[PDB]
PDB file of C-alpha atoms in Angstrom:
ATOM      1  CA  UNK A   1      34.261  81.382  69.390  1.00 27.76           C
ATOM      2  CA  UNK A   2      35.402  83.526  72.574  1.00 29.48           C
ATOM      3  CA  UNK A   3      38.038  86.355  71.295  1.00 27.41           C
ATOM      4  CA  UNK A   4      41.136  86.499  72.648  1.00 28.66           C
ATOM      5  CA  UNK A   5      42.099  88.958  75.084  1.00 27.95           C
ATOM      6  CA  UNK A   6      38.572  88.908  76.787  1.00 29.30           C
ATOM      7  CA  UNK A   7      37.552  87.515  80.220  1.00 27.25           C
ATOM      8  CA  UNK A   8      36.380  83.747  79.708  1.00 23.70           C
ATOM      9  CA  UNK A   9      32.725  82.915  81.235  1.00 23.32           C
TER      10      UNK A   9
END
């Protein structure tokens, strides 16, 4: 999954 915190693409 994407982490947290971190720009989503």
């Amino acid at each position: 999954k994407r982490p947290p915190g971190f720009s989503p693409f």
